[PDB]
């Protein structure tokens, strides 16, 4: 089965109100496991999943130092971007970075990532070959040239194929009995008269993990993806997730419709109806 290790990093400048806020959170699959927040009383990388409480002082000190080094890199990068885009100062801006590794069945690297966004738009991304960069606009081509002359990509490739996958494997070991478990969805269909002409059928899926799930409504064996209102998957707060998908159909015809649910915890998909 595939697993991933991902870090989501955000730096937000606040001109006149201090140094940029800098936050980093790490995830293994859909389970958050660490966090660093520059605005904490004592800024440091801290465990956010119980199974990380097993890592000692030396792990946390090194992680914290990498975070603080990256924090200064972001202070510099916010200033540089503002120059490249010739923006007025005094503006509050955002720099984001996502990096990590997805592994396959052999728990070996399958996809490595290291990419960035400025003010919420793509800036520059390491390509799947882990050697070249995709610059999103002209300012990024400037950054791309600098990185292409260094040999910058080789450095990330070595970390993604090595340390990244080795630490992911370690995390899966540490939290094995909770990280590899699944909670298959508990699903049901609710009914809501809308008029005196049509009714809303809502297919619910609750208490599942991991978060990936496919809910679909069908009529006579065909998908009704075009008529479906599908909310985004949302966290229940206990590590599990919820989602629902609804269709408005004719009164008295509700027995023609079936909801279909696919999920890693379901060897065979569910088929339900009102």
């Amino acid at each position: 089965g595939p697993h991933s290790l991902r870090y989501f990093v955000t730096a937000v400048s606040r001109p006149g109100l201090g140094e940029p806020r800098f936050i980093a959170v790490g995830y293994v699959d859909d389970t958050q496991f660490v966090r660093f927040d520059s605005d904490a009383d004592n800024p440091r990388f801290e465990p956010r999943a119980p199974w990380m409480e097993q890592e000692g002082p030396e792990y946390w000190e090194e992680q914290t130092q990498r975070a603080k080094s990256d924090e200064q890199w972001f202070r510099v990068s916010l200033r540089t971007a503002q120059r490249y885009y010739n923006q007025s100062k005094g503006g509050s801006h955002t720099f984001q970075r996502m990096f990590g590794c997805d592994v396959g069945s052999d728990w070996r690297l399958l996809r490595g990532y290291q990419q960035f966004a400025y003010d919420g738009r793509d800036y520059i991304a390491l390509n799947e070959d882990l050697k070249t960069w995709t610059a999103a606009d002209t300012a990024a081509l400037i950054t791309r040239r600098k990185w292409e002359q260094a040999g910058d990509a080789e450095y990330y490739r070595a970390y993604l194929e090595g340390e990244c996958v080795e630490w992911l494997r370690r995390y899966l070991e540490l939290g094995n009995e909770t990280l590899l478990r699944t909670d298959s969805p508990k699903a049901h269909v609710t009914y809501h008269p809308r008029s005196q002409v049509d009714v809303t059928l809502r297919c619910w899926a609750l208490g599942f993990y991991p978060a990936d799930i496919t809910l679909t409504w069908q009529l006579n064996g065909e998908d009704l993806t075009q008529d479906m209102e599908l909310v985004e998957t949302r966290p229940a707060g206990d590590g599990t997730f919820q989602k629902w998908a609804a269709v408005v159909v004719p009164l008295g015809k509700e027995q023609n419709y079936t909801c279909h649910v696919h999920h890693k915890g379901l060897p065979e998909p569910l088929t339900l109806r009102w």
Partner: peptide, 9 residues
Amino acid sequence: SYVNTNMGL
């Protein structure tokens, strides 16, 4: 696990 960006923007 976390890793630093090497070159400047």
